[PDB]
Amino acid sequence: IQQINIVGNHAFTTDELISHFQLRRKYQKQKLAGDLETLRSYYLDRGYARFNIDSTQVSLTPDKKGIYVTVNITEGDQYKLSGVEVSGNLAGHSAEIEQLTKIEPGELYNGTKVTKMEDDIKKLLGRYGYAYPRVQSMPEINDADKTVKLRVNVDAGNRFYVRKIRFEGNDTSKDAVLRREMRQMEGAWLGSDLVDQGKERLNRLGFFETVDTDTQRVPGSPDQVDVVYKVKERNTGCFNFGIGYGTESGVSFQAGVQQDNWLGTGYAVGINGTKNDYQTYAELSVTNPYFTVDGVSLGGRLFYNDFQTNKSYGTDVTLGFPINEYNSLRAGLGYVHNSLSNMQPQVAMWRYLYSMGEHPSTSDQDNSFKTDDFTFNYGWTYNKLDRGYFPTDGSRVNLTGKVTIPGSDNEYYKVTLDTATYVPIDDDHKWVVLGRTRWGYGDGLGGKEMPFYENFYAGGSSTVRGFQSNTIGPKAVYFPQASNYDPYDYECATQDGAKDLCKSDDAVGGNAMAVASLEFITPTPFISDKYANSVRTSFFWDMGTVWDTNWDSSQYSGYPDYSDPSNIRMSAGIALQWMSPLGPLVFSYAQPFKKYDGDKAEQFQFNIGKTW
């Protein structure tokens, strides 16, 4: 392609029109047709009612050393719209047709606007049930006044009914699973808007790779349609366990299962746990997204743990239900056991315990504390995303919290908010931009402070990439009774190695947090379809902070003030998210730009995903 030459074009220069050409080289394979239609629309959308391409030529240089492309353009004048007259077999919807048809006098003629008008008429009729209308628009060009008059031949046809709804490709999921997401009922008229919502709904569940639809005419009658959906199920969940032996751990093992769709019945369940010489963990989670036909949900979980010191276990059950097509509410009850022993003296912990009414001796680790509290939890969600696992549009909001009730030992509240917004960058969704924020705050009631084991933590791929998990925030300050680990202990904890109160690197968590990031999601043209189809990468800037409320910076005058929320940490990097057939995997590389003492960094991170 040595050059493209436009012959006889005076309205615009070459660069202005060439900027819209894509064949800007060898082996173009006649792709030029795409550019010529684009040129026609450029003029046809600008009022040049008489624009016509008369001929094109492609010329080769000697020995195929280059290509010469020339186009012969005939230009006309600019035309304006004079009005639109619509007639035909219209089913009484004259006001809606007039409202969509009406144009502003003097508006430049635009072929695209005419096509858009036709599409709006077809969509309206489809909404009422006229599945196959015929609309034919034509211009009338009046050279006497440089105007175009429009006429549209509209044929609504007739009403269609859906005789049956069938599904194919549902080899594993129970048939009831797909019928629950249809809004079109059998034995009723075919409003076209209702079928598309069903198509969208089956992609909201996240159990399928793709959803196809059809509206096939019934061969036995001109007025009936059979609607057929085709799905391709993907692997949903995995099962893992393991065990090993050695002198550093004796014998330990882990196991658990999690699925979003249990044996194809629609239930979401999962069980996991682990046991070793120092820690015990178990979890059971079962929920039914459709307890009742209308989609009231129920679920809950049980857990047990200990550590060799503390011990805890508890239970919760949550009820929830929708309140419109895009919003739902949740609420539930639960119980948590909290028993502490052999607690290492800490300033934050002991201030909490003193407020609770405890009176441990200074630096005495030979202690314990246990309470049994009853609480209530609640939340609110919004979800208008158009995809299950790789959203391209919409937004999601998750506002949750819990409170204590009379009879409990602790008195506290906690509120968190999870939001994300997807906005397409490209017309064809090659590039996508992702915004993410998290916010949270909580504290005690009645003069008490929140238990230290409920504090917020950050770091790791779940919050701010590039920092070690649960490391962002204020660090523990240890008191200088007895310890047999002096020979194996913290300098600020041992009564012999230190004689005063001082800071260490152990994070204690905070009463408030803020996390935000911006990601630019890029296509991966350098990765073949086998892998590229399930992976996206993005460029990002991450920031956030954690700080302590009720921090006595006046008493601890020699240490940093943990109440200052302005010490914002920031980092940025590149992350990859791959929906592996064996479970989605994520990793990223990022570097810090702003850090404070103790902000240990982890520039490269890897973990199992399946989040968001």
Partner: peptide, 18 residues
């Protein structure tokens, strides 16, 4: 099919996906 396992102190694990 679509599984991973092995044996390694001694350590072992297994994964199965649906």
């Amino acid at each position: 099919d679509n599984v991973r396992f092995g044996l390694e102190a001694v350590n072992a694990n297994f994964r199965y996906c649906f």
